[PDB]
Scaffold this active site. Structure first.
Site, short mmCIF file in Angstrom:
data_model
loop_
_atom_site.label_atom_id
_atom_site.label_comp_id
_atom_site.label_asym_id
_atom_site.label_seq_id
_atom_site.Cartn_x
_atom_site.Cartn_y
_atom_site.Cartn_z
N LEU A 1 0.82 -1.21 0.00
CA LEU A 1 0.00 0.00 0.00
C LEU A 1 0.86 1.28 0.00
O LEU A 1 0.41 2.31 -0.49
CB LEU A 1 -0.95 0.02 1.22
CG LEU A 1 -1.93 -1.15 1.37
CD1 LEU A 1 -2.45 -1.22 2.78
CD2 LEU A 1 -3.09 -1.03 0.38
N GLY A 2 2.07 1.19 0.56
CA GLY A 2 3.01 2.31 0.64
C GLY A 2 4.38 1.92 1.16
O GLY A 2 4.62 0.77 1.52
N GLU B 1 7.62 0.00 4.97
CA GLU B 1 6.66 -0.56 4.02
C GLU B 1 5.30 -0.84 4.67
O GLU B 1 5.24 -1.37 5.78
CB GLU B 1 7.21 -1.85 3.39
N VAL B 2 4.22 -0.46 3.97
CA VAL B 2 2.84 -0.67 4.41
C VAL B 2 2.23 -1.76 3.53
O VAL B 2 2.22 -1.63 2.30
CB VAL B 2 1.98 0.64 4.41
CG1 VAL B 2 0.52 0.36 4.76
CG2 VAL B 2 2.57 1.68 5.35
N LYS C 1 2.37 -1.82 8.97
CA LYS C 1 3.57 -1.01 8.74
C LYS C 1 4.76 -1.78 9.32
O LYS C 1 4.77 -2.10 10.51
CB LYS C 1 3.41 0.39 9.36
CG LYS C 1 4.50 1.38 8.97
CD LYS C 1 4.28 2.73 9.64
CE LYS C 1 5.45 3.66 9.46
NZ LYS C 1 5.12 4.78 8.54
N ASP D 1 3.00 17.00 9.61
CA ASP D 1 3.20 16.63 8.21
C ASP D 1 1.85 16.43 7.49
O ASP D 1 1.67 15.45 6.77
CB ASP D 1 4.11 15.40 8.06
CG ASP D 1 4.78 15.25 6.69
OD1 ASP D 1 4.78 16.23 5.91
OD2 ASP D 1 5.31 14.15 6.41
O1 LIG Z 1 -5.02 1.55 -3.17
C1 LIG Z 1 -5.71 1.93 -1.99
C2 LIG Z 1 -4.78 2.40 -0.90
C3 LIG Z 1 -3.65 3.15 -1.20
C4 LIG Z 1 -2.77 3.54 -0.21
C5 LIG Z 1 -3.00 3.19 1.12
C6 LIG Z 1 -4.15 2.47 1.44
C7 LIG Z 1 -5.02 2.07 0.43
C8 LIG Z 1 -4.19 2.26 2.87
N1 LIG Z 1 -4.98 1.76 3.83
N2 LIG Z 1 -4.32 2.03 4.99
C9 LIG Z 1 -3.15 2.68 4.80
C10 LIG Z 1 -2.28 3.09 5.93
C11 LIG Z 1 -1.01 3.61 5.71
C12 LIG Z 1 -0.30 4.20 6.74
C13 LIG Z 1 -0.84 4.30 8.03
C14 LIG Z 1 -0.06 4.88 9.17
C15 LIG Z 1 1.33 5.04 9.12
C16 LIG Z 1 2.04 5.47 10.23
C17 LIG Z 1 1.38 5.78 11.41
O2 LIG Z 1 2.04 6.20 12.53
C18 LIG Z 1 0.00 5.70 11.46
C19 LIG Z 1 -0.71 5.27 10.35
C20 LIG Z 1 -2.08 3.71 8.24
C21 LIG Z 1 -2.79 3.13 7.22
C22 LIG Z 1 -3.01 2.86 3.44
C23 LIG Z 1 -2.18 3.42 2.35
#
Ligand SMILES: OCc1ccc2c(c1)-c1n[nH]c(-c3ccc(-c4ccc(O)cc4)cc3)c1C2
Length: 263
Positions: free
Chosen positions: A13-14, A15-16, A31, A113
């Site tokens: 998703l993003g 490492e996520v 994460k 941020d």
């Molecule tokens: O393609 C759909 C999509 C694209 C990008 C993302 C998602 C879904 C998604 N769902 N949840 C998340 C996500 C990503 C980062 C966090 C986050 C990161 C750091 C933190 O301290 C707290 C929260 C929480 C949730 C994402 C990114």
């Protein structure tokens, strides 16, 4: 109940990574990783406009953060380059952004941020503030501490963060919300950084609204942007007063489409 604690990593998703429960099929964001502060601040958070924190696990040197999955993705991908989005959508997103920032500031936390890449949307398109990696406590035992650390993303940072040694935390988050509002209505960022050396920033202070991105924004949301993007952080509009702004309280958007039949 066996295997209820087993999660399958299906995609990045993003490492996520997106994690799906083996038994229940619940989708969460994991994460895989400063970190001690990020976990402690996330443990304090509980709000409908803040990404939920379910817990954490430390496997030797790698840290796993179990966070809320937002299927709607980033607000960034709802902004059409050079266009933005319909004004009623931007107003609903800004309303939800203010609710989250009011909450955070209320428990003495500054995000530091705020940008559309960190504003996520759930299945029902509800905005959620994410990434508390740069976040810090600015109020403890009802005593405010002034900030001095350089944090953020240059097109979204307030000008005091670049011109002053110390500054208050809350007007910095208000400024970044104002640049987010600009991006949503014009689909472009007004300047690279809020400095006198930046011509685009100089033109805004000179009230040259006939130029882009301001020429694309209607007078009502532009009047609010005139109150948020104020160089002096002490003169800049506070959130209690943003809630009193004419455009903020202007009826523009209908409710969620709801199934209906006739005759
Ligand atoms: O393609 C759909 C999509 C694209 C990008 C993302 C998602 C879904 C998604 N769902 N949840 C998340 C996500 C990503 C980062 C966090 C986050 C990161 C750091 C933190 O301290 C707290 C929260 C929480 C949730 C994402 C990114």
């Amino acid at each position: 109940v066996p295997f209820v604690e087993d999660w399958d990593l299906v995609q990045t998703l993003g490492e996520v990574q997106l994690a799906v429960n083996r038994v229940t099929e619940e989708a969460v964001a994991v994460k895989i990783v400063n970190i001690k502060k990020e976990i402690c601040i996330n443990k304090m958070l509980n709000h409908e406009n803040v990404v939920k924190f379910y817990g954490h696990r430390r496997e030797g040197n790698i840290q796993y953060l179990f966070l809320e999955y937002c299927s709607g993705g980033e607000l960034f991908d709802r902004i059409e380059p050079d266009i933005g989005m319909p004004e009623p959508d931007a107003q609903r997103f800004f309303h939800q952004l203010m609710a989250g920032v009011v909450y955070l500031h209320g428990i003495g936390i500054t995000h530091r941020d705020i940008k559309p890449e960190n504003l996520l949307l759930d299945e029902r398109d509800n905005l959620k503030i994410s990434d508390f990696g740069l976040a810090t406590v600015f109020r403890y035992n009802n005593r405010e501490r002034l900030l001095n650390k350089m944090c953020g993303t240059l097109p979204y940072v307030a000008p005091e963060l670049l011109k002053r040694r110390e500054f208050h935390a809350e007007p910095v988050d208000v400024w970044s919300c104002g640049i987010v509002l600009t991006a949503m209505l014009a689909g472009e960022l007004p300047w690279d950084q809020p400095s006198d050396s930046c011509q685009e920033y100089s033109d805004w202070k000179e009230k040259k609204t006939y130029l882009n991105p301001w020429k694309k924004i209607d007078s009502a949301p532009l009047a609010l942007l005139h109150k948020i993007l104020v160089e002096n952080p002490s003169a800049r509009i506070t959130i209690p007063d943003i809630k009193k702004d004419r455009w903020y309280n202007k009826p523009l958007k209908k409710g969620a489409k709801r199934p209906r039949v006739t005759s």
